[PDB]
Ligand binder design. Structure first.
Ligand SMILES: Cc1ncc(COP(=O)(O)O)c(/C=N/C(C(=O)O)C(=O)O)c1O
Ligand SMILES: Cc1ncc(COP(=O)(O)O)c(/C=N/C(C(=O)O)C(=O)O)c1O
Lengths: 406, 406
């Protein structure tokens, strides 16, 4: 069973004060902190075997290559892809989704075709499609939400038609905490002749991913949200789809033959990795996976279920506070205080050492759906505790009192 | 004056053996090693102030933002851009050039328009243009090289016409070591109504860059070649050009307003930075710049002039070896042994602890121009010494003897 003291001990950043109070970091949905295992992986790379990638040239070059390709296999195993050919290293979830929008959607959309998304999508999983449909003259449609911020499969079946070519949807909402029924949405997309594109930025850090079981056609994730370095992510795609897609970027490493005017591409996955890769970051992402696997994703998910249930209960103890989204959820709470702008909530909480985020959370259409212009969000991970949630709710109570007096 | 002992002391990776011999790393054109100042910058970021970017939310968030935007200013100063609006963080030189090819070239090319490049270009500065001209029905042309692998301005004037819209060329060749006359090429492009795109991946680490003096329209560089982290680079563009270019990628952070179907973009530079940025890497690149500035780029350039002159002289002492390119050059030597495949040269050198690269160096058209299928390359940086070059030439002599006997 997961010992939170022993876990927290591995994250040096947690052990400091802000404005004279112990740090209470509740913004892991914006980005996660790193354990020493990951930081020391980066250190060991740059101290010992940094070199460009390509085996059989020199000793450090081979070690760097083995580290990079080793990390690719770690990722394959971690999301249960069939093949390393299906695992592409990118700069992050946003780039991954843009690659699908550029290389897949822009080549498979014509007037009359639909791309179906949802009102709860992050911008990363909206704007690329807005642009893909404009370029092709296709139509963008939205699946409606139920009143508690979940999606009913009946509404999916209604919105998706035989003209739908792509359904794109979040696994987990970074605002509502909703866990969408991706496996069942994939069947509805496939039944209609569509592919499904899953935004896994908020799911992958926090619960097991099995792409064969989900049967998603594409899946995108970010390192920085799952204890890993910044600047790296993954695009998973089914091999038969990737084979038929053209590259999104061109250069060295992704070519086989280069003539004056024409070139041929390398096989997968390298076809989609142009230039010197994100060597250190990818290796550190592999170390993040190792670390998360050692703890156990199921264990992490159980911890967060407990935190979430505790937070929702304690928020219900506060008058004058609204929480958005459903009871069954991931480890985050987005809320507003009745008489206090969420930016001022965040400011006052930070003076008590508590880090939360305020704003639209890159989901302006969802904020409109919620009839608000902004919200505050506390988001959790494997290093957070019930005591920290106690601190949050006590601070929210004091916040209300403080703005009442003023 | 630059003390090479004190410089080498700061690079932990240099102090190890390969196959029982002291490491002799001569592959800095593939990638550079890092000093403790940069590694410790990454450490301090992840140990102390990692958070997503956006000021005025919480204390670590503001510190991360100030670090990231601080690094942007460091870069601006370093290449003498006018404005931080002209400094875009990317994943590397390759992505930077692809962004120009996508957002600039594909919007400003029609049948009859020309893109002019050179035979010595790296793939990163070939394939994006091949693709841009195919998409628009424009024409790709090549500036010819002189016999010593330099470019004459007369040939530039001949190749560039009033139908030329883009000239793209390397500052420094990663194979020939040629330093191209970029400032004079820019005047010829401008006189013809063209923009100039400069591939600065091999120049920026090794000599001062002044984009106002060069008058380049775009300039691309990589962190990993200039003592900085992997996975990060810069695209510089003149502000008036960037203003009129559309984004290459879409998502959070680069938007202002998002509706269901339409969005507006943020101002520069953020218009071109979609999603959570490369926070740690950018900060570490700023630390690489600080480190390089403290030593002095002119000092580094003088050291490499000395190494290059010494290497060329010592290579001329070897029978049965060909060196490609000119006498006046950057700090690298590409060569072949008369009777030995360069892959076998690299293998045998690595057993003596010496790291060089063999192959086409991502310049297959240049290899064809040279009438070879592959070459070996020794490339230098601020931590390398004449003693290391002695080791290289002694090993090449032994290599020749060894394959003669066999
Ligand atoms: C569900 C989901 N989809 C996409 C993203 C963007 O991932 P990124 O490219 O790593 O910024 C994210 C990351 N969202 C962060 C961020 O925008 O800071 C957050 O929710 O604060 C997300 O949670
Ligand atoms: C002149 C020049 N142009 C572009 C690049 C590609 O930069 P990258 O995107 O950091 O791989 C490079 C990096 N070339 C390396 C590499 O391909 O490993 C080398 O020359 O070995 C270059 O030197």
């Amino acid at each position: 069973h997961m010992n939170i003291t022993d876990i927290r001990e591995q994250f040096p950043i947690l052990h400091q004060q802000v404005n004279g109070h112990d740090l209470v970091y509740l913004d892991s949905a914006a980005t996660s902190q790193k354990p020493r295992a990951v930081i020391e992986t980066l250190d060991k790379y740059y101290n010992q075997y940094n070199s460009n990638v390509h085996r059989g040239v020199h000793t450090l070059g081979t070690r760097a290559t083995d580290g990079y390709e080793g990390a690719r296999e770690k990722v394959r195993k971690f999301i249960n892809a069939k093949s390393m050919a299906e695992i592409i290293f990118t700069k992050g979830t946003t780039t991954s989704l843009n690659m699908v929008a550029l290389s897949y959607a822009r080549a498979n959309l014509k007037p009359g075709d639909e791309v179906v998304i949802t009102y709860m999508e992050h911008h990363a999983n909206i704007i690329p499609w807005q642009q893909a449909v404009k370029a092709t003259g296709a139509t963008l449609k939205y699946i409606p939400l139920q009143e508690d911020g979940t999606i009913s499969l009946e509404d999916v079946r209604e919105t998706v038609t035989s003209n739908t070519k792509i359904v794109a949807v979040s696994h987990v909402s970074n605002v509502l905490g909703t866990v969408n029924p991706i496996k069942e949405m994939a069947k509805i997309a496939h039944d209609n002749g569509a592919v499904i594109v899953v935004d896994g930025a908020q799911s992958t850090p926090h619960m097991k991913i099995d792409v064969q079981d989900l049967d998603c056609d594409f899946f995108a994730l970010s390192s920085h949200k799952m204890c890993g370095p910044t600047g790296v992510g993954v695009l998973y795609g089914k091999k038969a789809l990737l084979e038929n897609m053209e590259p999104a970027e061109f250069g060295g490493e992704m070519i086989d033959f280069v003539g004056l005017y024409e070139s041929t591409w390398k096989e997968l996955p390298w076809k989609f990795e142009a230039g010197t890769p994100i060597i250190a970051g990818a290796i550190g992402l592999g170390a993040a996976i190792d670390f998360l696997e050692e703890i156990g994703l199921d264990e992490i998910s159980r911890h967060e279920h407990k935190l979430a249930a505790y937070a929702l209960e304690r928020f219900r103890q506060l008058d004058g506070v609204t929480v958005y989204g459903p009871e069954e959820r991931a480890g985050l709470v987005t809320f507003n205080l009745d008489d206090v702008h969420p930016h001022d909530v965040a400011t006052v909480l930070d003076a008590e050492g508590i880090a939360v985020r305020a704003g639209h959370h890159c989901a302006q259409p969802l904020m409109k759906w919620l009839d608000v212009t902004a919200t505050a969000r506390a988001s959790f991970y494997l290093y957070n505790t019930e005591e920290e949630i106690d601190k949050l709710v006590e601070a929210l109570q004091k916040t209300k009192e403080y703005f009442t007096n003023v």
